[PDB]
């Protein structure tokens, strides 16, 4: 019953004999599946985590530059020279200045210089690549109890929480009380996971395309770095300046974190705490109820009346939704039903919350109906002290 | 001297007759300065530095949200209130959720929220305007004294610096020996001072078209501003999502600093260090040197022999560069100096410093003279020892 209060809810009923029935699950959905003689189960797709991606690679996004050094030549002088020309954490660049006299040479010309800057970074992203194969979808089974606070009770105290991988066969599934059900499960994601990568921002983190990512103009370090100093291309966030042949400077590009987001407008978003994610892929699922079994077809009808414990209240899907206490004595019984018409000649309704039996002289029952268009009865216990609720739909 | 050695060195010479030379100045630039029987001066402008502008905006660039509160409405009982909504330095949303026995309401459907998150700005540029009646323009004279250490020294201690302003009619020049003269100097910058805003980020500042500036999609302070925390259009920077329906977040959408250089790419960059910047802008002057008069012209020729005491250099522009000490007895005298012909007969080339005399027994002179193309003989001294050293140009 955790799906009834959920705008995205979908019904999914049993193929007319066959106790299979195939539902579709994705963040913010919700399947109410109900089948001939079986109960009416509730299944929500909790969380969707992949394992333990890969590092494809890993950018830096905003730097520090540090212990700046410089050698020149006069004219006529080969050129400079700095040993940490050769120190990968540092980022050089050749160039020219006019020399004389005044500044140290005997001769007057362009004369040779290096200047060079300790790279240091701050931030970084960290691009993934994600396989299918190793996709860990949770998911939660709310059978449709009747149980007094189960009516979208997220807690998850009611349903059973079910693992599931593609590459895991099918798995089963034990109700307490219904006895078992199983679950064959197909990937079917979205888009591809080859051309698509993981790109992560301390807790904003994307979903876009390999090369798009890899085209990306910034400092970087192959995945399998654990240096994380020797930062390949270190000049697209440095820039030398040498505007008047005096001197030569070096300069940081700064932050490009908000120009990344920025750039990742059209991107596919997901939300995630560090680790648990909220994708967007819909999982296919095939259901076999061979196992399940209604619960308690060994009662009797109970002959009490009951008592509206809280009120007929309709969903945002035509279904309506009511709690009753009973007072007889019948004890372990199962709850008269039914969606009659203005005459209480036909019937004109369904039960979603298939066989409502009461449990505890003092345990509230909650039944969601589906009624008909336009009037219908609400026909619940037995002749003495039947209640005849009325009801008008859409 | 001080212009021996640089690149950028423009030669003016007087108007054949009037002593009075326009020339033009701009950082990274020299002018050396010449006129019949008139000392050879060199030019260079310092610094360019506008008094105190006015910040006409103030952009935030990067921003920190904080206490975070919302209010939530049941279907049908109108549109939640927060406090916040009305403190300016939070932003808020309205928006609607599920709701239903399973989250607090007697009904199901559609719930109205409000969500608010205090925004802190972290780090902010400053727009600013500047007007070219403001302007002083600091300009250094270094007069060709010849002096032994004057050649391409920048060190300031041998010119005599100038302040200027558009706004300050004519000013006088004191140069310690040869007498005064005087600078007629106008603005005339690269572009207009109106259509133009000055940048500033901490140590980058641009100087960007006022429109553009404006139209920044950034959270921002009027100038006048000193509250700093009331911004206006704070959600450019606050992303409000509420995917199925059951919550909304809010969100910092991170440091602009590069992203705001990466679109400075175009615009027109501007030194400065915390006040004292260094423009671009043509910044012409007229020179009258009537007030101006060679020095010592009351001395004889000297007749001693002279020793070359710093090799005949060469300058990026033709002329040539020699240093010589005096051996003579003659004290405070004139050097004989001239480019003759390869046979001594006629004279081919021109002294650049004008008039050079020793002035004490023991301290070297720099003379800088422009030899013709080709051979030429660098005569100096007299008869006894007078040194006659060749040269060839180009
Ligand atoms: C969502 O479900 C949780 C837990 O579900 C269990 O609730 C119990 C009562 C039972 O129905 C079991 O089958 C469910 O799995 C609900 O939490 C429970 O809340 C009730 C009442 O608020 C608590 O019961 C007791 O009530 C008496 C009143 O006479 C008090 O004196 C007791 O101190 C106690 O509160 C019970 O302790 C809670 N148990 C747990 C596990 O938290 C929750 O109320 C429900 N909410 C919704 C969405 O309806
Ligand atoms: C650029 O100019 C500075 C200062 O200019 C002055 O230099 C003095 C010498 C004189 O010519 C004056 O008219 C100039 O305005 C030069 O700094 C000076 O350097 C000299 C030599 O390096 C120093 O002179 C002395 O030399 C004797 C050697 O016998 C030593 O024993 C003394 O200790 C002393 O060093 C003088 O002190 C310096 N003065 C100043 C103000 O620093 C600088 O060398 C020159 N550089 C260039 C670009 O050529
Ligand atoms: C960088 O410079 C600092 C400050 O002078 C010094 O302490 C440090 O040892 C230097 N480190 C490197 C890597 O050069
Ligand atoms: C914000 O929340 C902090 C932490 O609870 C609290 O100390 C502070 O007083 C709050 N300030 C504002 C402006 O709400
Ligand atoms: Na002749």
């Not at 009611?158 to 089963?172: D, L, M």
Request: a neutral charge; one cysteine or more.
């Amino acid at each position: 019953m955790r799906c009834i209060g959920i705008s995205n809810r979908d019904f999914v009923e049993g193929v007319s004999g066959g106790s299979w029935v195939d539902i579709v699950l994705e963040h913010g959905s919700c399947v109410t599946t109900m089948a001939k003689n079986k109960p009416t189960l509730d299944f929500e797709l909790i969380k969707t985590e992949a394992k333990q991606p890969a590092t494809l690679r890993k950018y830096c996004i905003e730097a520090k530059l540090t212990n700046t050094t410089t050698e020149s030549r006069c004219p006529t002088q080969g050129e400079p020279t700095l040993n940490e020309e050769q120190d990968k954490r540092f980022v050089c660049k050749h160039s020219m200045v006019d020399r004389g006299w005044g500044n140290g040479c005997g001769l007057f010309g362009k004369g040779g210089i290096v200047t060079c800057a300790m790279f240091t970074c701050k931030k970084n992203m960290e691009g993934k690549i994600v396989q299918p194969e190793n996709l860990e979808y949770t998911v939660v089974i709310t059978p449709h109890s009747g149980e007094e606070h189960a009516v979208g009770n997220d807690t998850g105290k009611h349903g059973k929480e079910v693992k599931i991988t593609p590459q895991s066969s099918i798995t089963e599934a034990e109700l307490t009380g219904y006895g078992t059900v199983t679950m064959e499960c197909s990937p079917r994601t979205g888009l591809d996971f080859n051309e698509m990568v993981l790109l992560q921002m301390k807790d904003k983190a994307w979903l876009v395309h390999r090369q798009w990512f890899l085209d990306l103009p910034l400092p970087w370090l192959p995945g399998a770095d654990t240096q994380g100093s020797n930062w390949i291309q270190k000049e697209t966030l440095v820039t030398f300046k040498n505007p008047h042949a005096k001197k030569q400077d070096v300069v940081v590009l700064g932050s490009q974190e908000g120009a990344m987001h920025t750039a990742l407008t059209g991107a596919t978003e997901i939300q995630m705490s560090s680790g648990n994610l909220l994708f967007t892929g819909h999982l296919k699922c095939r259901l076999r109820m061979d196992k399940l079994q209604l619960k308690g077809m060994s009662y009797s009808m109970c002959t009490g009346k009951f008592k509206v414990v809280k009120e007929i209240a309709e969903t945002q899907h035509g279904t309506i939704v009511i709690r009753v206490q009973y007072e007889g004595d019948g004890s372990p019984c199962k709850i008269p039903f039914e969606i009659m018409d203005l005459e209480k000649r036909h019937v004109l309704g369904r039960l979603i919350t298939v066989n409502p039996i009461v449990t505890e002289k003092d345990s509230p029952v909650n039944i969601e109906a589906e009624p008909p268009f336009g009037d219908s009865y609400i026909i619940i216990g037995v002749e003495p002290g039947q209640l005849k609720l009325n009801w008008f739909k859409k």
